[PDB]
């Protein structure tokens, strides 16, 4: 099974299990009364594959190492990028940043810091009757945020005790390289989106592939099928730092 | 359902009932104290959504998420009724209608929106109670928590103040039920109470209105609630400049 | 004469969605088709619930037919957006006007379309016209005063060049759709038609009435858009 | 909800088993002399008359008497302890024995909060140090929200008003205290409150015209006395 | 109600009239002087009418709500600053090291001075174990800002629970306003006590016989031992 | 171990053979494939003590562990810039892409060069996940002071935290001064452990018999596999 | 006392049963080996009391041991820090410490920047700094460095308590002379071997105790100090 020593984007979202090629649902639109709308989520597949030598790998304990440290790791890093930046066209999921709501750049005044913009965004999330539960950042941006002062020796956030992923103002932070530099995504992901797992990550070996029989190598493939549903896109705010 | 904030239900005291009306004595303070005979009727609060048929009928795990999503909105409807629901009809006669106007003479020159909240925290004492909660529109709470004087100093600490909703040791309740520019502060724990007749329940109807045609499905979530106001002069409602 | 459902291929399915490959001629592309719902409802008197045979006679004679008439307008003129399903005219190839002769009549444009259907290596199998256009096609005669192919005695059915015509009010006036539907498109039925009676629906309770509903769930895949050609004769 | 400290919490507590209580009072003047005094256990009563249909539910009436009626009894016991004329069935309150504020100490540009400082100083003239203060909510609100030419608060702010503490000394804002009148003094040393009977409740249906009008009367009764051992340790005053 | 000066110091029972100890003296090496502490007596007397005392629980109310309370409040003020003249005890503020005036800075706040004193305690090879403040000065300190809305220390309730920099604080009216006292009390002093508080009624003192009065005396015997006067810094808020 | 080493910054893996064959994908800045083999090789660190130390027993063991597992510093010098030919394995600096000097400027300092290198890591379709450089260079970068800017007083907290641009920094004497190395080490390269470290004491080694001394030797074996050398970039300031 | 961290806590412990230990010192060029020997030395602290304190029995035996062990600990800390190693002395960490590289300093450096440069300079021995040793006054003046901008280098006066500098433990002690600091990886560079624990002996005749009815209480311990890599220890003085 997979697993990383860090909070992942799918941990922020709600988890469900589905047994169909698609599922329909209702999207709550709020005007800043709520008007409902019909939506559908299609179960799409994310895969990661690597080429490998034949004999050393099917006759050694270097296979568990090879799929654990390359395949599951890459597959996780790929689903994390899909859930956050998917397009929704073809085999692409529709990511949080695709449906997210534009940050309102009228909430920031002269002299604002990054903490002020984070506060403005945690606000703008509240305009959906939902409470912000998670933040998604770039590791560079998260490092800059965790370590800044307040025109005084005092020390907002916790720096190198809270910078270690950890939390910020009570909300979990996911610092991920999938997130562009200078871009933040705040929201109540707990009750604004949901990932439905059709099939768990499965691994398979292809001896026969695109001229693999004559090249003396295998292809190892790890794949998983899931869908992403966005109940209230107004609960997600995607913004850019100054 | 609360989602890491206090609900207007949390400011009031709570109890159980077993009838549709039980009535009580209202302490009418004059600005000694007189008494009134008042009756509180058990009204019904309902939140409904018209979804499709395909969304609902599925495995038990696929039916629970919408049930929780609906129990969530029921709580917001309950707050909307508790805060400002007029007496006429099946509404609940909420606090803002029973509250007392805000004495505008208290204002000093050069005040800010927080100064008016301080004045309203005072005025609650004229009922012989103490303020135990503010109710603000999220816009107003946000605009207050990030205020500053001529000097580069925040009144309420930092932007961390907007989160962890509290003003001078008094819980702040930011809710969409409160209209922009209107504030409501008072000793809720002693000036009001909520009597619960029935808990939340969910029902599904295919034949409602025209749902049988166009294959719709109305999901309804109901609770039964009465609101007893024991001292209207403890709750103060006002508007911002 | 029959239904657009009879022109297309038919399959069964057991899923909410449908994945397939659209062979744009031969390349390939992945396409999806979600199952949608089509319903037809009729107002009736309370007296049908008794005398069960009358209810069955009404249902099979007149209810199962209106549902097909209603799904014609969806299978033909759809969008695929929302609760609609993609229609033959939406996934269609514009009729080539270069095939037009100097003074060819409306019965020759259809022959040109029938030939154009073959440019996808698939032979045409059906025509779809508007009732008024079909009416005018069978009665335009000529200057001499003879029906070009008509004549009351010399008429078989809604047929033209040996292909079914299927006139439907769903088709707009001025538009025609010629295609080899039997091997280029396929309707996948999620479940067969179901009938349900409601007495509470709207004010049926007070007014002593009934609503009979007939529902069906289906999608449709368009493997070869090039086989279906949509034209608009001047 | 115990969101504030009462006058009783400001005083020494004591229990008794007699209907009168005699003590001695120190008479320190501007050494000490001892004069014998006595205090008679008085009765404090608070009553509310409710419709006769409020007893149909035992738990709800029980709750009302438990947490809504006793509060009124205590809050009027405050009004008796703080200021009682002594004559009749009114126990002798802190305002009856309190010493007058020495107006000589007032300066020209004397702020309203400085007079409390002068009173705290005058409390030291009885070889006691001032305990918490008692004053009206309006005056406490004005004191804690003083503003200079600019908007900066001098020594209070609404955080002070909600905390009921100035200069480390507890503050009791009560409606019983009149507006403009303040009372400082070493209440823990000077005076004490003696309890005879814990509060009791009584329901009467025939009281007054409660029979022809559908209502009851609920009565809460308490027995206590107030013993002042050093009136010079308590100071009245009025703002100007 | 709160921790007292007796709680900051180190306890211990004596069964004699006086005891000798060694004072460790530090230069601003460690020398040793010879000192003695004599068991002194602290008493508080309240005289009340003899009538009800002898048949009621009114006696208990005098004993603990009127006498033990005053005796504790007077013991705490004797421990802080006595004089050693007669029955006076030796006071912490009498035996204390003057706060270094030169240690201050231009913009130092009322907490920077406490930091300076917490340092100065370390010139005796010990560390601060507590602070003794006037309630007014503690109320003022606990509500200080930092050139920003941010509050140093904590909130007004319980005055931040009477703890600054992690060190318990004793707010007492005995401490003069504007004077502070830090130091390693638990290690630099001891409160050797001979006899616990006892209560006695006279019925004969002075002219109580003719005037119909009792007198109730509550008294205790204890000594205070000082080991390092350099581990106790007494200073003034400038 | 107050910092994370290069091993903690690559992929970890286990092998039970004296050599392993792997497919290295090569990127044209299309992706092609090459067959490659990595040979398990021994890393060894020795220190010579004096005799009669075996009687120290429990404390000797403490010396044996603490001051030997020394070997970790030599293994990383092998992993980073091993010559590749001989009895030493192929290092990260051996198969690494030369820094693109066209990304520089006139006044660019030294952290901007690392930013440019991180940018150039993306041409492999990977992303930088670490930086390796000299402790002197890291000290100069972290404590860099500019009179005009607000970055004055340096970053002693940054220097002690070992984090730059949000990525880990590895200051080691293994890497020569003036040279830097960035890249997606967690994807491109993997360390395959064959056998764990063992300790061997020799009395006859060289002159140990004459000179009344011992030789303690700690040795382990392992291989290094590089899947995408284009991910790694090595340059000089 | 346990309200502060002692120098013995920065180094490594270990027991020895002999009066001499042989070890190998690792010289690093900025690695060769030397062979050195550590001799078990004796550290003794004595307090001069009166004879009347003896008559109180537990008030002396059960209360003065607390202060006596404290004094012994402080004296041991001082000797470990700056013992000269000549004539029954320990080998002071300041004696083997490497001189601070003054060239590391820039223009505009405060006293904490020099400590940062010293924290760097330890790395040239392939070790990482484990602790700092300062004078209490120097630590006070560092933790309260009111920057010219008008902001504290550290959090505030809170910094002085809970002695920590950039995650490194700071040991303030009167043993370190004012103006002198020592950074290093003490948990690896050196260690302390304990031969026998502290023991207490009482003398009535030492010097003129008999004449002046005094007493001398002497607590003594025996230990050796072994340095393995002096380059890991950097000693310097503040400008």
R_g over Cα of chain E: 21
Q: How far apart are CA E234 and CA E179, in angstroms?
A: 7
- E167 neighbors E128 (Cβ within 8 angstroms): yes
Check the CA dihedral F203-F208-F213-F215 and report its sign.
negative
* Cα end-to-end distance, chain F, whole Å: 28
Main-chain dihedrals φ then ψ at residue G58, nearest 5 degrees: -60, -25
Q: Which of residues 27-46 of A touch C (CB under 8 A)?
A: 38, 40, 42-43
Write out the two tokens for A32: 């800043």
Listed in sequence order, the residues at least 6 apart from B30 whose beta carbon sits closer than 8 Å to its beta carbon are none
Contact of chains F and B by CB distance (3 or more pairs under 8 angstroms): no
Distance from CA of D60 to the nearest CA of B (A): 9
Q: Strands D165-166 and D169-173: what pairing? A: antiparallel
Q: How far apart are CA E158 and CA F208, in angstroms?
A: 73
Q: How far apart are CA B196 and CA B9, in angstroms?
A: 11
CA distances from G33 to C181, F48, F77, F135, F201 (A): 91, 8, 21, 24, 17
- G115 neighbors G165 (Cβ within 8 angstroms): yes
List chain A residues with CB under 8 Å of F12. Answer: 65, 69
Nearest to F180 by CA among F109, F103, F98, F104: F98
Among A36, A130, A151, select the one facing B3 at the smallest CB separation: A130
Among E20, E24, E118, select the one facing G50 at the smallest CB separation: E20
Q: How many helices, marked H, and strands, marked E, lie in chain B?
A: 7, 11
Nearest to A184 by CA among A226, A144, A227, A231: A144
Q: How far apart are CA D52 and CA D212, in angstroms?
A: 11
Listed in sequence order, the residues at least 6 apart from A52 whose beta carbon sits closer than 8 Å to its beta carbon are A66, A217, A218, A219, A220, F22, F23
Q: For the CA atoms of C139, C140, C143, C146, what is the dihedral angle to 10 degrees?
A: -30
List chain A residues with CB under 8 Å of E150. Answer: 150, 152, 154
Question: Which residues are G146's β-sheet partners?
Answer: G152
Among B5, B51, B145, select the one facing A131 at the smallest CB separation: B5
Contact of chains F and G by CB distance (3 or more pairs under 8 angstroms): yes
Write out the two tokens for C199: 């007495």
How would DSSP label each residue in A132-161? --EEEE-HHHHHHHHSEE-SSS-EES-STT
| Residue spans of alpha helices (H) in F69-223 | 71-81, 111-121, 135-142, 156-161, 185-188
Cα atoms found within 13 Å of the Cα of residue G83, Cβ hemisphere only: 23
- F154 neighbors F145 (Cβ within 8 angstroms): yes
Q: Strands E216-222 and E40-46: what pairing? A: antiparallel
CA distances from B182 to B108, B185, B239, E71, E158 (A): 19, 10, 4, 55, 33
Q: How far apart are CA F123 and CA F231, in angstroms?
A: 8
Q: How far apart are CA D154 and CA D161, in angstroms?
A: 13
Q: How far apart are CA G209 and CA B117, in angstroms?
A: 76
| Beta carbons of G67 and E227 less than 8 Å apart | yes
List chain A residues with CB under 8 Å of G152. Answer: 152-154
Q: How far apart are CA G137 and CA E123, in angstroms?
A: 9
How would DSSP label each residue in C118-133? GGGT----EEEB-HHH
Write out the two tokens for E134: 């006037």
Listed in sequence order, the residues at least 6 apart from F150 whose beta carbon sits closer than 8 Å to its beta carbon are none
Check the CA dihedral C120-C124-C126-C130 and report its sign.
positive
- B21 neighbors D44 (Cβ within 8 angstroms): no
Write out the two tokens for F217: 């030797």
Q: How far apart are CA F222 and CA B46, in angstroms?
A: 69
Give the residue from chain G lying closest to F47, CA to CA.
G33
Resolution as reported, in Å = 3.1
Distance from CA of C174 to the nearest CA of B (A): 31
Q: How far apart are CA G195 and CA G40, in angstroms?
A: 7
User: Within 10 A of F61 (CB to CB), how many other CB atoms are there?
Assistant: 11
Q: How far apart are CA C151 and CA C135, in angstroms?
A: 13
Q: Which of residues 151-180 of A touch G (CB under 8 A)?
A: 151-155, 160
- B171 neighbors B202 (Cβ within 8 angstroms): no
| Beta carbons of G154 and A151 less than 8 Å apart | no
Q: How far apart are CA D149 and CA D143, in angstroms?
A: 16
Among C16, C37, C200, select the one facing B215 at the smallest CB separation: C37
User: Mutate which of A138, A140, A176, A209 to test chain F, going by most F C-beta atoms within 10 A?
Assistant: A140
- G88 neighbors G41 (Cβ within 8 angstroms): yes
* Cα end-to-end distance, chain D, whole Å: 34
Query: Strands (DSSP E) along chain B, which ranges?
Result: 13-16, 24-29, 33-38, 43-52, 134-136, 166-167, 170-174, 182-186, 192-205, 216-229, 235-239
Q: Strands A34-42 and A148-149: what pairing? A: unpaired
Give the residue from chain E lying closest to D157, CA to CA.
E143
Query: Strands (DSSP E) along A4-146, which ranges?
Result: 14-17, 22-30, 34-42, 44-53, 101-102, 134-137
* Cα end-to-end distance, chain G, whole Å: 32
Q: Which of residues 135-154 of E touch A (CB under 8 A)?
A: 146-148, 150
Asked if the C-beta of G67 comes within 8 angstroms of chain E's C-beta atoms, the answer is: yes
List chain A residues with CB under 8 Å of F167. Answer: 139
Main-chain dihedrals φ then ψ at residue A102, nearest 5 degrees: -60, 135
Kindly state the DSSP code that residue F99 receives in the 8-state scheme: P
Nearest to A145 by CA among A242, A79, A48: A242
Q: Where are the domains of chain C?
A: 3-91+185-223, 92-184+224-234
User: Within 10 A of B121 (CB to CB), how many other CB atoms are there?
Assistant: 24
Contact of chains A and D by CB distance (3 or more pairs under 8 angstroms): no
Kindly state the DSSP code that residue C172 receives in the 8-state scheme: P
| Beta carbons of B213 and C16 less than 8 Å apart | no
Cα atoms found within 13 Å of the Cα of residue C146, Cβ hemisphere only: 4
Q: How far apart are CA E122 and CA E183, in angstroms?
A: 9
- E74 neighbors E222 (Cβ within 8 angstroms): no
| Beta carbons of A138 and F167 less than 8 Å apart | no
Give the residue from chain C lying closest to B215, CA to CA.
C39
Chain centroid offset of residue C99 CA: 26
| Beta carbons of D167 and E143 less than 8 Å apart | no
Q: How far apart are CA E63 and CA E84, in angstroms?
A: 29
Q: How far apart are CA B77 and CA G218, in angstroms?
A: 80
Asked if the C-beta of E85 comes within 8 angstroms of chain B's C-beta atoms, the answer is: no
Three-state SS sequence of E122-142: HHHCCCCCEEEECHHHHHHHH
Asked if the C-beta of D214 comes within 8 angstroms of chain E's C-beta atoms, the answer is: no
| Residue spans of alpha helices (H) in B84-230 | 95-98, 113-123, 138-145, 188-191
Q: How far apart are CA C2 and CA G217, in angstroms?
A: 120
| Pairs of CB atoms within 8 A across B/E | 19
Contact of chains E and A by CB distance (3 or more pairs under 8 angstroms): yes
| Beta carbons of B189 and D1 less than 8 Å apart | yes
Q: How far apart are CA F154 and CA F142, in angstroms?
A: 6
Write out the two tokens for A187: 């929201």
Write out the two tokens for G168: 């490194």
Q: How far apart are CA E162 and CA D131, in angstroms?
A: 19
Asked if the C-beta of F23 comes within 8 angstroms of chain A's C-beta atoms, the answer is: yes
- A49 neighbors A222 (Cβ within 8 angstroms): yes
- Which chains form contacts with chain D, at 3 or more CB pairs under 8 Å? B, E
Chain centroid offset of residue F216 CA: 24
Q: How far apart are CA G166 and CA F107, in angstroms?
A: 31
Cα atoms found within 13 Å of the Cα of residue D1, Cβ hemisphere only: 14
Asked if the C-beta of C84 comes within 8 angstroms of chain A's C-beta atoms, the answer is: no
Among A42, A90, A91, select the one facing C17 at the smallest CB separation: A42
Question: Which residues are D220's β-sheet partners?
Answer: D46, D201
Asked how this structure was determined, the answer is cryo-EM
Nearest to F222 by CA among F116, F98, F72: F72
Q: How far apart are CA C150 and CA C156, in angstroms?
A: 9
Q: Is B162 exposed, middle or buried, given 0-12, 13-18 or 19+ CB atoms closer than 10 A?
A: buried
Write out the two tokens for A149: 């002062």
Distance from CA of B206 to the nearest CA of C (A): 9
Chain centroid offset of residue D222 CA: 16
Give the residue from chain B lying closest to A25, CA to CA.
B55
Tokens 């005007």 locate to A31
Q: How far apart are CA D52 and CA D48, in angstroms?
A: 12
How would DSSP label each residue in B25-44? EEEEE---EEEEEE--B-EE
Write out the two tokens for G142: 């560092």
Q: How far apart are CA F32 and CA C93, in angstroms?
A: 40
Largest CA distance in chain C: 65
User: Mutate which of B128, B148, B233 to test chain D, going by most D C-beta atoms within 10 A?
Assistant: B128
- B170 neighbors B188 (Cβ within 8 angstroms): no
Question: Which residues are A40's β-sheet partners?
Answer: A24
User: Within 10 A of E25 (CB to CB), how many other CB atoms are there?
Assistant: 14
Nearest to A227 by CA among C84, B52, C82, C34: C34
Tokens 């395959």 locate to F192
| Pairs of CB atoms within 8 A across A/G | 16
Asked if the C-beta of F2 comes within 8 angstroms of chain G's C-beta atoms, the answer is: yes
Nearest to F73 by CA among F161, F168, F162, F7: F7
Q: How far apart are CA A46 and CA A29, in angstroms?
A: 29
Nearest to D189 by CA among D134, D100, D123: D123
Between helix D137-144 and helix D112-123 the angle, nearest 10°, is 110
Instruction: Report which secondary-structure segment, H or E, holds A62.
Output: helix A62-66
- Which chains form contacts with chain B, at 3 or more CB pairs under 8 Å? A, C, D, E
Q: How far apart are CA E181 and CA E99, in angstroms?
A: 9
């Amino acid at each position: 099974m997979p697993g990383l020593r860090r909070l992942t984007i799918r941990d922020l979202l709600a988890q469900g299990r589905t047994s169909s090629n698609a599922l329909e649902y209702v999207r709550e639109e709020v005007f800043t009364d709520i008007t409902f709308s019909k939506q559908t989520a299609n179960v799409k597949t994310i895969a990661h594959w690597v080429q490998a030598s034949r004999q050393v790998m099917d006759d050694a304990p270097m296979l568990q190492s090879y799929i654990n440290n390359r395949l599951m790791y890459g597959l996780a890093l790929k689903e994390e990028g899909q859930l956050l930046n998917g397009d929704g066209t073809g085999d692409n999921l529709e990511g949080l940043n695709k449906v997210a709501t534009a940050y309102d750049t009228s909430l920031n005044a002269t002299g604002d810091t990054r903490a002020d913009i984070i506060a403005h965004a945690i606000y703008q999330v509240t305009e959906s009757e939902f409470s912000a539960s998670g933040i998604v950042l770039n590791p560079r941006d998260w490092h800059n945020i965790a370590l800044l002062k307040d025109n005084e020796g005092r020390y907002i956030f916790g720096g190198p005790q809270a910078f270690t992923s950890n939390i910020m103002w009570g909300l979990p932070v996911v610092p991920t390289k999938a997130q562009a530099a200078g871009t933040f995504t705040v929201g109540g992901f707990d009750m604004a989106s949901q990932v439905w797992d059709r099939m768990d990550a499965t691994v398979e070996v292809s001896r026969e592939d695109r001229d693999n029989f004559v090249k003396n190598m295998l292809t190892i493939l790890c794949e998983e099928r899931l869908a992403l549903a966005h109940y209230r896109p107004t609960a997600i705010i995607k913004g850019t730092f100054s």
